Amino acid sequence: SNFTQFVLVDNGGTGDVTVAPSNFANGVAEWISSNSRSQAYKVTCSVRQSSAQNRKYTIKVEVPKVATQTVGGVELPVAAWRSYLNMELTIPIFATNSDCELIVKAMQGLLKDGNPIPSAIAANSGIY
Amino acid sequence: SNFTQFVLVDNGGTGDVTVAPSNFANGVAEWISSNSRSQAYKVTCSVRQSSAQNRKYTIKVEVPKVATQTVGGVELPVAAWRSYLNMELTIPIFATNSDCELIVKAMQGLLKDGNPIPSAIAANSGIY
Amino acid sequence: ASNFTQFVLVDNGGTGDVTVAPSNFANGVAEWISSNSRSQAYKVTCSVRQSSAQNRKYTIKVEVPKVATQTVGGVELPVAAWRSYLNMELTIPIFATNSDCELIVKAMQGLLKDGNPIPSAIAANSGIY
Amino acid sequence: SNFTQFVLVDNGGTGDVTVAPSNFANGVAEWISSNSRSQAYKVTCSVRQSSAQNRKYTIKVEVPKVATQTVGGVELPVAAWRSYLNMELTIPIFATNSDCELIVKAMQGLLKDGNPIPSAIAANSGIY
Amino acid sequence: SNFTQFVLVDNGGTGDVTVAPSNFANGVAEWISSNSRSQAYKVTCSVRQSSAQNRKYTIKVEVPKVATQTVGGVELPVAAWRSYLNMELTIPIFATNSDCELIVKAMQGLLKDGNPIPSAIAANSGIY
Amino acid sequence: ASNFTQFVLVDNGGTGDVTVAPSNFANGVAEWISSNSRSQAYKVTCSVRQSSAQNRKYTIKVEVPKVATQTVGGVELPVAAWRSYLNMELTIPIFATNSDCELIVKAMQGLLKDGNPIPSAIAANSGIY
Known part of the structure; x- marks a missing residue:
């Protein structure tokens, strides 16, 4: 079963962010981190099956900024802002397991450390 | 300069797929692999700047299936089909370099080998 | 041999220097930003x-922010209290050689040299008199 | 009082270009070199006060073309022999003296020798 | 990376004309010589990608008129002192690297010394 | 002393050379073709x-075919799968001497010399970066 707990942010043992399964309604699997839901990943x-020949994956990730809100003396654990990631992967039904593995490898290499896109994202910049 | 050649598919030295800069028109940087354009990654x-507070990245990747087309005795290098990846990353302007690095790390960990989503993609399956 | 490199924008003598690094070249505009959030970055x-048939025009803009922390809806956010804007437009004839461009650069450098009238007036919130 | 003469182009003691006060009409300070008005710096x-919250400095510099120039001659067209710098500095009214010193330091560091922009200007080139 | 300087006019080691990178705005590579913009190569x-089946290379070369020229002077009209070459190369997307090498060889052989077209150009003549 | 002669268009080192020979001069356009059928010929x-009163313009076009055999209605025919087109337009002022034209020719030759940026980019299906 792949509907299991996994590490979303790997901080080297200590400080790791883990998300656990929480809901599987309407065919949408959902993972939520522990503690307060308002400050949860x-x-x-x-x-x-999008079309007769294509299967479409929809993956969404929300990264919160942990903060404390004080209104009228009442403190609440909230998120100051959230970063939203929207991924849509379309794979034709003719793709074998090797083709899917190659697609996954391409996706992993797109965001590997040192590559242009992750470096631009991590530096609050674009392509220069 | 990050508008450089990089390895898209790492096959371990031999068989690596590299994409080189080809166009930067209308602010859209483009990388294309070598050889025939019809069978090119x-x-x-x-x-x-999408909104007053957000910056949006748009990343697209096309993975072709190399094949040879023969119509009337004429052979042409074409792609039997293509796999399309569409990524849209929205980052608020309040994010520092550390926040962007964390976002990049989350994106990399989403597609790391052994994780649910890449395993599902590489196995021509969904979440089970 | 590319000239799209990082440089020290504000020289504070080693410590506290403000450094801007290349960040964008979209639509033909080269951009440098500092290692801050884009709401607080230089x-x-x-x-x-080619402005005219016989003229070339440079457009240089510099943004100097005043960093501050603002509480919006009970949450503290990194913002800039205000921003200082510098707009430079340099028109050079196509007949000017490299020596003429060096002369223009030297004139621009000497215009803002420490001790000269204009920088002293700017640094003292006063005019020229 | 700061309306004094200064060295505009420093050539190491010899060949220096010095601009001296020449006009103060309408409160606008003007410096010119010891040349004709068509060949002078x-x-x-x-x-x-440009707006309710901002003060604006307007600095204009004119640089003659020296290569293959005739001292004291009629050189036409004018646009082919003169370089124009139009600098506008907007400072909010909340800036103290130290903030203005920091702005001046930033302006000085923008045009320091070896930095990208002055190197590009001095080489008849852009950013590459 | 191929955006480097090269010898545009080869004069046997001495008197060679070398063009160096000067601009990369909008993804267009530009080379100029160590001259003013009105007298430089x-x-x-x-x-x-010009059409659905073709890629187009746009190469533009500017050559100054050297005979009876004044280095660093204002030479007017501009049209009487500059030669313009506008080269467009359309390559179908089915062409491999070897096909592009053959096209490059054909282009080189078109302008080789002793061939009709270069001889006609160098003699201010047509085809007779 | 006529310059309307044949020349090697693609030099493959003696063997496999592509040679174009004069074929037409109708309507003031000189044409070279290779020793193939006109559906497969270079x-x-x-x-x-005289484009303007003080300018002369050269128009040079080169066609590089990709030969193939096509079956049309059950019959095999010699055709070209696709064709690569080169369009060159050279404007020279009437005041340019023979030395200036030689300079233009040398610049054109050095632009496409082996090892230079543009030919390397063309031969690698890539741009300049």
Whole structure:
């Protein structure tokens, strides 16, 4: 079973962010981190047959900024802002397991450390 | 300069797929692999100020299936089909370099080998 | 041999220097930003174009922010209290050689040298008299 | 009082270009070199309250083309022999003296020898 | 990386004309010589997908008139002192690397010394 | 002393050379073609005209075919799968001497010399970066 707990942010043993399964309603699997829901990481994944020849994956990730809100003397654990990631992967039904492995490898290499796109994202910049 | 050649598919030295810069028109950087354009990998990236508080990255990747087409005795190098990846990353302007690095790390960990989503993609399956 | 490199924008003598690094070249505009959030970052942009048939125009913009922390809806956010804007437009004839461009650069450097009238007036919130 | 003469182009003691006060009409300070008005270095500076929250410095510099020039001759067209710098500095009214010193330091560091922008200007090139 | 300087006019080691990178705005590579912009050799190159089946290379070369020229002077009219070459190369997307090498060889052989077209150009003549 | 002669268009080192020979001069356009059927032949055209009162313009076109055999209605025919087109337009002022034209020719030759940026980019299906 792949509907299990996994590490979303690997900080080297200490400080790791883990998300656990929370809901599987309407075919949308959902992972939520522990502690307060207002300051929790969210991961959702769903796969559907978009067209007669294509299968589409929909993956969403929310990264919160942990902060404390004080209104009228009442303190609440909230998120100052959230970063939203929207992924849509379309794979034809003719793709074998090797083709899917190659697609996954391409996706992993797109965001590997030192590559242009992750470096631009991590530096609050674009392509220069 | 990050508008350089990089390895898209790492096959361990031999068989690696490399994409080189080809166009930067209208603010959209483009990478294309060597040899025939019809059977070439394509990577495009662009960053824009979507709203007053958010910056949006748009990344597209096309993975072709190399094949030979023979119509009337004429052989042409074509792609039997293509796999399309569409990524849209929205980052608030309040994010520092550390926040962008954390976002990049989350994106990398989403597609790391052994994790649910890449395993599902590489196995021609969904979440079970 | 590319000239799109990082440089020290504000020289504070080693410690506290403000450094801007290349960040964008989309639409023909080269951009430098500092290692801060983009709501608090120094920004430098430069572009060159053929304005007329016999003229070339440089457009250089510099943004100097005043960093502050603002509480919006009970949450503290890194913002800039205000921003200082520098707009430079340099028109050079196509007949000017490298020595003429060096002369222009030297004139621009000497215009803002420490001790000269204009920088002293700017640094003292006063005019020229 | 700061309306004094200064060295505009420093050539190491010999060959220096010195601009001296020449006009103060309408409160606008003007400096010119010991040349004809068609071949002289001209510097003008003025400051005004542009908006309710900002003060604006207007600095204009004129640099003659020296290569293959005839001293004291009629050189036409004018646009082919003169370089124009139009600098506008907007400072919010909340800036103290130290903030203005920091702004001046930033302006000085923008045009320091070896930095990208002055190197590009001095080489008849852009950013590459 | 291929955006480097090269010898545009080869004069046997001495008197060679070398063009160096000067601009990369909008993804268009530009080379100029160590002259004023009105008397310099300029080379620009860019490639784009012109149609659904073709890629187009746009190469532009500017050559100054050297006979009875004044180095660093104002020479008017401009059209009487500059030669313009506008080269467009359309390559179908089915062409491999070897096909592009053959096309490059054909282009080189078109302008080789002793061939009709270069001889006609160098003698201010047509085809007779 | 006529310059309307045949020349090697693609030099493959003696063997496999592509040679184009004069074939037409109708309407003021000189044409070279290779020793193939005209559906599979290399084509080179050149023409010069007085574009303006003080300018002369050269128009040079080169066609590089990709040969193939196509079956149309059950019959095999020699065709070209696709064709690569080169369009060159050279404007020279009437005041340019023979030395200036030689300079232009040398610049054109050095632009496409092996090892230079543009030919390397063309031969690698890539741009300049």
